[PDB]
Design a protein around this ligand. Structure first.
Ligand SMILES: C[C@@](O)(CS(C)(=O)=O)C(=O)N[C@@H]1CC[C@@]2(S(=O)(=O)c3ccc(F)cc3)c3ccc(C(F)(C(F)(F)F)C(F)(F)F)nc3CC[C@@H]12
Length: 253
């Protein structure tokens, strides 16, 4: 059950939802590639206190996750699913969706990312005190950039990152399995029709996204043990909910 014309309709529906929930447009990000942070500006970021850079980054991650919630709410089938399943899917997939979406603002020619109005390399995030996590994020982006994704490909791949029937805690597993299968078909059909099936082999292993997320959660536990009042007083509520309700409020609109 689901004919070719229904699969093609799902492709365009997913692409539209992705376009409408993008933080910034792709052309805006490309037109800013020459706006790079100077050595002085880079030094200023490195000289910020660890707690200040953590709070700035947790706020940026929170803002980006808010767009993933909107993308999920526009995805066919997501709002039909029970509240427990919606939250399980968003808690496990939101960081992963943001990590994949970040490749649009990543310039492989100089290994820089769009951050606070300009492009900057890994060295910009030195005050965080997590070089191994920063390296992993930059390597993941570099390896995604080698695939040269079109916007339609990121829309379909990120819908699949989110709609995963294997996430622990799902009460209606089969209902998510059908949704995932329809999106798998829509993604593969789009790759077939556009002569892009060669990327399937070169996509990152599902364990790579899982490793980046566990590194993020473990480094946050290190930060919170040393600065518990900072996390309580200045970290965004949605960020503590997901990584340390708000999600219920966002899902009811
Ligand atoms: C492109 C855009 O910048 C948005 S835009 C288009 O410019 O508006 C974006 O999508 N950003 C994403 C949302 C915020 C950001 S970031 O810019 O602050 C950034 C980027 C690369 C890094 F190596 C570290 C941080 C971020 C913030 C905090 C963390 C941490 F897990 C970290 F990895 F840093 F540890 C943590 F723990 F701090 F939360 N990780 C990330 C990785 C994803 C990006």
């Amino acid at each position: 059950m689901a004919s070719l014309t229904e699969i093609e309709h799902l492709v365009q529906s997913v692409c539209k939802s992705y376009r409408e929930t993008c933080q910034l447009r792709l052309e805006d990000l490309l037109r800013q590639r020459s706006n790079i942070f100077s050595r002085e500006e880079v030094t200023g970021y490195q000289r910020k206190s660890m707690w200040e850079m953590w709070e700035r980054c947790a706020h940026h991650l929170t803002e980006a996750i808010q767009y993933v919630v909107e993308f999920a709410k526009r995805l066919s089938g997501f709002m039909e699913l029970c509240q427990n399943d919606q939250i399980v899917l968003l808690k496990a997939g939101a960081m992963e969706v943001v990590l994949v979406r970040m490749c649009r603002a990543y310039n492989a020619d100089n290994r820089t990312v769009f951050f606070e109005g300009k492009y900057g390399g890994m060295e910009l995030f030195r005050a965080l005190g997590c070089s191994e996590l920063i390296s992993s994020i930059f390597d993941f982006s570099h390896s995604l950039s080698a695939l040269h994704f079109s916007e339609d490909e990121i829309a379909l791949y990120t819908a699949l990152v989110l709609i995963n029937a294997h996430r622990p805690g799902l009460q209606e597993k089969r209902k998510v399995e059908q949704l995932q299968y329809n999106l798998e078909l829509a993604f593969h059909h789009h790759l077939c029709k556009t002569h892009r099936q060669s990327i399937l082999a070169k996509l990152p292993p599902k364990g790579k996204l899982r490793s980046l997320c566990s590194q993020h959660v473990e480094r946050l536990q290190i930060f919170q043990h040393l600065h518990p009042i900072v996390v309580q007083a200045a970290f965004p509520p949605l960020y503590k909910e997901l990584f340390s309700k708000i999600l219920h409020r966002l899902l009811q609109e």
